Amino acid sequence: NKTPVGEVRPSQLLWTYGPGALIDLPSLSVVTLGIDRWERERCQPIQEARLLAAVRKVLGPQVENLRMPPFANIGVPVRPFPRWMRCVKCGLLSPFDDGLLEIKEDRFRAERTRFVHKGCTGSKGNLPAKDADAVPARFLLACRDGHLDDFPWHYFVHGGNSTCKGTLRFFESGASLQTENLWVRCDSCEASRSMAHAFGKAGKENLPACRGRHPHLDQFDIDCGEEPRAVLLGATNSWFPITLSALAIPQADIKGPEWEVLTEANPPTDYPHFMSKKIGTPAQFIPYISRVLLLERLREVNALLGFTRVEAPERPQMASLARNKPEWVPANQVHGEGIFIQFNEKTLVAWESLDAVKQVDEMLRGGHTGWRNSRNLDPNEDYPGIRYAMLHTLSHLLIRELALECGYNAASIRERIYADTSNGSPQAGILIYTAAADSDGTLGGLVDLGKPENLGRLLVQALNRSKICSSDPLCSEHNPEKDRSLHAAACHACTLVAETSCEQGNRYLDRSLLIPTLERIHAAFFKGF
Amino acid sequence: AWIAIDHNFSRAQVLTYYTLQLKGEHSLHQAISDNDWILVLDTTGNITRVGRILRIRSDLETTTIFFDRMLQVKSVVSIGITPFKFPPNDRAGRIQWTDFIETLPKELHITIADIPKIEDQTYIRELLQLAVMDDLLGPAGGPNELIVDMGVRDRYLVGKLAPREAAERGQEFPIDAEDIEDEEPDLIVKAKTAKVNSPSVLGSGETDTAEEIDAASNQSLVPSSLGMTFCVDGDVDRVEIEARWGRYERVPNDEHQFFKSNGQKAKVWKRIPCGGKIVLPLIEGSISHNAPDSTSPEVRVQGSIRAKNDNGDRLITLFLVNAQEEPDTNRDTAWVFQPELIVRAAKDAAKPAIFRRRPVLDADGMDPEREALEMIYRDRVEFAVGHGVAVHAEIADDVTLATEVRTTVMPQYEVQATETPGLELSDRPAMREMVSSGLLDMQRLATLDIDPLVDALSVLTNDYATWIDEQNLNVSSKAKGFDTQAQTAINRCQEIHTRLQEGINTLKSNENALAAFRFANQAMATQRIRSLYALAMRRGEDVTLDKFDVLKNRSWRPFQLAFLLLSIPSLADPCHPDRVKPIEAYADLLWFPTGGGKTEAYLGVAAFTMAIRRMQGNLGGYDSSRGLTVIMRYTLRLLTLQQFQRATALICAMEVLRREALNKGDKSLGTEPFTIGLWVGNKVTPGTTEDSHNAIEKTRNSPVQLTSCPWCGTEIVPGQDVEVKKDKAGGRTFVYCGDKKGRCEFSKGKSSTQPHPGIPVLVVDEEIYHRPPTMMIATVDKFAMMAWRGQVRTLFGRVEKECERHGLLWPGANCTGNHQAFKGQPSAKVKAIPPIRPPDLIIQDEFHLISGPLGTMVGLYETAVDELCSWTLNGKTVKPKIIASTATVRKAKEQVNNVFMRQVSVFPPHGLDVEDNFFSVQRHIKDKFGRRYLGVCSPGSSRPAMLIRVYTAFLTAAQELFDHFGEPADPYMTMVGYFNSLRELGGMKRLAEDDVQTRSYRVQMSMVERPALAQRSVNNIRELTSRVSSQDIPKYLDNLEVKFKAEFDSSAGKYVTKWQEGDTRAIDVVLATNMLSVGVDVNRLGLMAVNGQPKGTAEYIQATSRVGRSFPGLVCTVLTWARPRDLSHYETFEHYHATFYKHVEAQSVTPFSPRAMDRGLTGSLLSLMRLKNNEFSPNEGAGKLDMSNQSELAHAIEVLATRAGNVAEDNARKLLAENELKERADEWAKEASKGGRILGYEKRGPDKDKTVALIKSPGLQAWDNWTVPMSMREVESGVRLIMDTKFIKDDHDWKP
């Protein structure tokens, strides 16, 4: 009753795919099921207590262990979605479970499995009967609170409710130059409409209310008061993960003992997976940087707890993984290497009390208040600070320059910032490590660039590039108090990285805090460059 | 029927031959259209040219006319006898038809149908470029065009600026809902079907996979401004700025008469030009906003000006912004189309050249190689950089000053062609003497006496010394600021001359060397002749052997012979200093532009090495008449299989001469023959003789790696040309030629009595481990098998015993060397034999890919390969010779020292210029054509939309060029599409056969006007990738050489194709991944469309250089705005394409880090432990580590620690390596003394019920000390997906 389809690397089950995500395969598309229908007896545990005690606080004391992905029919279970398809030859639109579509397979070469329209005879129906290939339809319906469901084709095409029971087609522009237009036509009523009327301001007047379908649980809620939104197949704004990661340090916030250990006078080197060296400090950067520390052996474990649909997360908007309170969560671990940069305390405290810094801080706090009002949340909590924006911007620029100079892949590199200032133990420093176990610069390639002959050149080129952006007069004039954004003077063409690398989600970033820009001068932290 | 007057305005010579340029706007010249004759005069009144018009283009001041047929008058003809009127006031004038028609035979001796057609192909590449530029960028219908039945925003793809209100809110879909609300539905809809497809695709399939990535959206973006950055000299006061753009406006209904299908009126727009000039004072501070055109005052220009610098120049930034407001109806009237900015000097200045170099952007660090690169490229100067657009500069007489700068939306640049000197009339006289008298002839150089040999070889070194002598006059004269580099450049050329003379001297004082030289020249000439005959026969043509034996085919090229003379003294004596000491052992590195013969350069060294080894004798107590000599190792899997065919021909020719020599009683070459084997993974080739039998058994109801015979070209049928001898313990597989008459030397009629009958190859692994071949061609990843299998030591010559019936023996094998009489064969007994000499030469190709983790993993396992290939001679220790070859050199010194632990010697050296080093000449565009590039960047659209539009434009413009000119358009009728990954090729494959054919068929079926495109039918699509089966690959490569067929029809007045019954069809679109493994110099392909910037520069130069070798080339890179690397390359387009080698990305090779010692150390330790001794060779040797055997463990540990210390150059690394090795050795020592079990390496054999394994494989558990890899690269095994198919009913219903 089951059949193989394909394979994926075990890294992507906690960052791109996972229990709830659309998977665009070469021949079809599926959605991963939840975890109480997984084979528990074939998952190898991972021993890590300092993260288990963090997951148990959030999800309750019943959580048991962290378990690796399951590894001649053993694998991750999926199910076809969306459940409507299209025919290549006759251009027909019909759900999979009317009975008019059939499934072909070949077991030794499972990547060639597809659906077929049995007995296709042409659009008019005047050719010898054969079999043609069936492809999915590429629009869905997303709800902010966590629901995804099929697009309502019949209601959309008939302009509301109707009694008709005909069939449907797709039509195109018929010109050689228009490329994106689509049309849906009824064979009996001759009702015709276009797909443009589902996006924009016209979407509110034309689409119906949410139904409340969690596809991976096979379960319906009663009603949903939120408004719906239409999304494409395979777009990046359809699944976001919730993650919690830790570093394997020698032996109740996560990041407390990490800062305590990494900035000791003599960082220990007797544990097998933690080994550090104290090489150097560059020439131009004496007053700012106090310590630069290399890590030759590093280890990081992860976990996965939930997901959200339309907007990145900031707990009533999060959706669970199982039917009840779960009993284990997926996990992962990677052995790698990293670079740790520490900054000078007195230089920072001197820079915190200037004037233009205070004006920029007031602007950002006004923007934060504007953002948190529009989503019904407490507007006086969880503000990071002004130090965070500066350090975080510098980190994003450094990662971009590591990719540009050395030819690396962008997703291979991960950041981690330390800027808490609440309990009287001030922090300042960034970390950069390696994402994958088979990535670029894996075998000692990143630690090569931690020597003072290369890091200064990388820093100088990183800072001198960001003086004028490629979308420049409108980028520096951007004011976040006007329209409730969390960024100011930080666009796609100068500051943002891929969603795998980022720790926060492109929130709280500004580049005029670092160098003189086209509109502000006196807010810079690095002077004379 | 017009008369015009020439005035010689245009500049490029090719354009001035085929065009006429008139003054004024086209509004005066509306009486001139296509298919018209115009008769061109000069100023005095003399008839020169008669032509026919193809196309007309226009601008704000000038109109350009392109011809298609033209005749050039050779004599001098006067206008006085002509009855016509002189041109009225230097404009166009009308000709009476009858007098023109009558005068054409009378006073020009021609008719209409006798006009010759245009033959040049540079003209054709220009016309195609103009066509695609007009259709993608615009304006297409002139500056005062009319657009019908569609919106102006979607007509064009590139170069448009949005109003500021739209840019802040962004997009979610390409079409806005409120802009499409017409009264009627879209009446021109058609069913979304693969209609009239007939794909004719071969649809081959296999299993393969690649990597993946992601990025942000290219849909939600549109820019509203563009700028630049330029640096200007001091002591000036003001400049001139010109900006121009275009605006569109809607024509009300009563003003036009363009009707739809159903009788209603259609939408018509109209275009109006815009722009003006300003003058700006140079005062520090931000520029005030200014508006050039008063009628649209809400579009600006701005920027900032900075203070003076340390040298005396200024930084200035300029922009151009759209700040208009978005209306409610006709939203497109606030958009700006086709912008451009020009900055020049004031009208009244004394000196124009005021633009200088950008500041150097120093970073307080120097690298001598970097300064050398800046010395070489001192006439390519980068003046400006663009912000959201590309830039361009006009260079004055001084090559460090510029007069004008501007901006380009789609930029172009043409690259000069590298050639080898000797054929042109302006080269050095000695090269022309060598070519004219034939001193490079390979047949001549094998028969000369020694003194004419020295006479002939001396000319090259004499002229090289002379060239270095005139290179030294210009140390401080022409290379100002670079004295140190100008001296270090000449030092290495002097060393090169010294080594050339040393090679000739070694050749003079020896006889074995002269014999080997003659042998190598003879073999190379014969193989070079015969390969072309084999290729001609395999394609089914009718040729004879004496056609190909001419002087053109059997000659050298100077850098190849020079490399040969360099390479001699290190191979002709094992006691040379390059092979006896661990310091100053120069490892040669050869790099050259791709296309020159590096492969035939480095095959001659292998031939010379092979011949010389058998003439020396058993030095040092080692056998020397058999065994492996040359190892030749590669990185990928497909290029190895392509190069094996090339190596077989040389082996065949050497076998022919060895067989012919023995018939005269000359036994210098020995008795054993020359054989060549593969050594690749078990997926491609069988392991044992049982599997070789099984494959042939399954065939009649894979060791056949060859398709045709190398020596004769007859087809090889796998059914009847394979014999597998019976095997009680081992067999021998033979492959025969397919000749039926019996005239090939490798057929069954002739070669049956030889010790190795038939084609002399080896494919099966156990067959190689018994009778080792002379030559080996392997892949890198096979070398990880040393720590697993202990029988590999036969390949290095570590043997003791031998059986007469089977071959060489290793411990723990089947045969022990004793037999009884059986099948009548006499009984035999084992014998003992002195050891064999380890190999002499290592060759590495594509050495630039040895970097990163692959380079580190190669470097750590190379400790064993260098150790095992060593021996003793009079107390000294002899080590092998290493040769590598690259395409781009960058930080080669540290790479070679980390990988091979040698010095370096790059040949040929630099010189003082990039254009005129001794062995290469970078020619000039005025005398030989180049390779043009073109670039396209566009936001808003998706990647499929851009790909579809570009493909359609090229395909339909090529057809229009075909319809008028004929067969010269053949290079540009088949389109190559190069990709970077398998997933994206799979995505484009679906769109190729569905959408492009439909959009290309209906290209002229609407009311929108497209001037250059034409009607084309697409039928054929292929694909070259690793998923194509190996039997089918040469059929696809041999299909690419058929041309499109043409025939002239006088009814239509054009050319048309027609394919007869049973004939092959030419291919239309071809798609190719990384493996663009073109077999030969295929003369047809001349148009490539790169899809995305590759991750490396070497890959970009390798891939794009295949097209355009015999006919002019044209590449178009398609870049996406959403990726950082693409945008960074777009803004700096014209400087990256003039200084390729300056921009090569970085590399690193670092073994002996902790993360690489956690992988490779155990594998290297066990490899050196096993393949060097006898007690640890068998599978049961793991328990042998007693308290009496530990002295060999110390030897291996000392070797590894010594290499770690010598390469890392730090004692901390040596201490770390010593500690790790000590821990592993102690861990091994504890497992031996645990009695009650039998210890081995693997669980294998009938004793496995009590066998306990020692080492592991990468599997479920995490990595450990005892995990030993099986390749140089591993990904952990994935997880597989399990579908569920069922039915679920949906009772719930929708509601508002």
Ligand SMILES: Nc1ncnc2c1ncn2[C@@H]1O[C@H](COP(=O)(O)OP(=O)(O)O)[C@@H](O)[C@H]1O
């Ligand atoms: N001596 C020669 N005379 C004429 N053509 C040659 C000669 N040597 C090589 N060639 C041509 O050059 C090609 C060799 O290319 P190849 O050596 O494979 O380039 P590389 O190995 O440098 O990438 C051959 O196909 C041959 O046609």
